[PDB]
Write a protein that binds this ligand. Structure first.
Ligand code: GSH
Ligand code: GSH
Lengths: 216, 216
């Protein structure tokens, strides 16, 4: 079983957990609690990682850092990366846009001026959602009929944003169905009902938004 | 010839230009000047791009956005992405860390409080440089004896940081040699001596740092 290391939050690791649960990969999570900073910063350079960071992934074949590299390793091993250069590039494009979507809310949430930034962010949100709604179109998933790691990235990003603006998906029925479709996948549904599931926080505990001890 | 679109700055597009020049790919750059905002937003949704953004890449086979997706497409076509899942993941890990390196300086540079943030950033820089110095080790390039897209990513990131802190590489001779090695590559040296080379600005024109009309 691979060892995964990360804070006890959703943040960057959630899409990886979801993917691991979807393809039935056995893994052990090394959870770092709110007060484990010292614990991490003391072993950070003792784990044998080339470029130390959280999250990290370790198994008999690989030692990795970088949330996207970790997600793509599991996806690669399961044939979800793309078979041609054009396809692999299109996949990377979707990942990049998904990173932008999640990082956008992350940026303003860790900002002391969150309250101020929030208004501008909410003003632009609609255009962003439309772009994604138009991209998904009539497809069940981002790349067609089959689920892949990008779906779990976008799903998590949308779920986090709906915590800030609950009606953000109201005018986009396909995005709403997309969310339900993911939550209805047998392996996902079961994981979300387990005690392994981390529902909160969305961001780091110290965030102006999404960092409480409980949902707002 | 592929068409590349981006602002007339280094920013996110520089590593792509460098790579295109290294493998001899013919391309046409659609440059957006400091006052071309309107020029971009007016047709941004008219270009047929799935997820509109700058930079964008267009050729007879592909239409892409996302700087990393674009860089990886060219790299993929040239066999620099990796042959196994473990190798491709390791490559992605390096890319992610390189993105972190460049985005770190980018973050504080577009921040109005740049002047304040600068001190904290400079305090941590040494640790970051050491991490990269240790990673490169005795290798001529990040992945061994052969240059790849990641080298141009890290090179550009280090060059940008040396503009903020000129002695940041002083205690890391291998990183210094790495920089020289890249600049000594025949295709790179020639490109940097051409009139196609964009030397400044590093960040967007309106950045607190690296956004002037000329170097500081
Ligand atoms: N680009 C990196 C970002 C990693 C990162 O910022 N990790 C944060 C939490 S989300 C951290 O606590 N890192 C620990 C450290 O820097 O030592 C990734 O995608 O993994
Ligand atoms: N994650 C994206 C970021 C793209 C981005 O932020 N582009 C900026 C300039 S660096 C821009 O002007 N985009 C135009 C737009 O959003 O319409 C990437 O790596 O390409």
């Amino acid at each position: 079983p691979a060892k995964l290391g990360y804070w006890k939050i959703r943040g960057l690791q959630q899409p990886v957990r979801l993917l691991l649960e979807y393809l039935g990969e056995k893994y052990e999570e090394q959870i770092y609690e709110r007060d484990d900073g010292e614990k991490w910063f003391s072993k950070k350079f003792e784990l044998g990682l080339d470029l130390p960071n959280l999250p990290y992934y370790i198994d008999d074949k690989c030692k990795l850092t970088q949330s996207l590299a970790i997600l793509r390793y599991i996806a690669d091993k399961h044939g979800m990366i793309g078979t041609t250069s054009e396809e692999r590039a299109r996949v990377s494009m979707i990942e990049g846009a998904a990173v932008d979507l999640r990082q956008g809310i992350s940026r303003i949430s860790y900002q002391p001026k969150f309250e101020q930034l929030k208004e501008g962010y909410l003003k632009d949100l609609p255009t962003t959602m439309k772009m994604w709604s138009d991209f998904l179109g009539k497809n069940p998933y981002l790349r067609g009929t089959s689920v892949s790691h990008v779906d779990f990235m976008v799903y998590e990003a949308l779920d986090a944003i709906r915590y800030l603006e609950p009606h953000c998906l109201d005018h986009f029925p396909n995005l709403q169905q997309f969310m339900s479709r993911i939550e209805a996948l047998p392996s996902i549904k079961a994981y979300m009902e387990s005690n392994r599931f981390i529902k909160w926080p969305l961001n780091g505990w110290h965030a102006q938004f999404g960092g409480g001890d409980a949902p707002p």
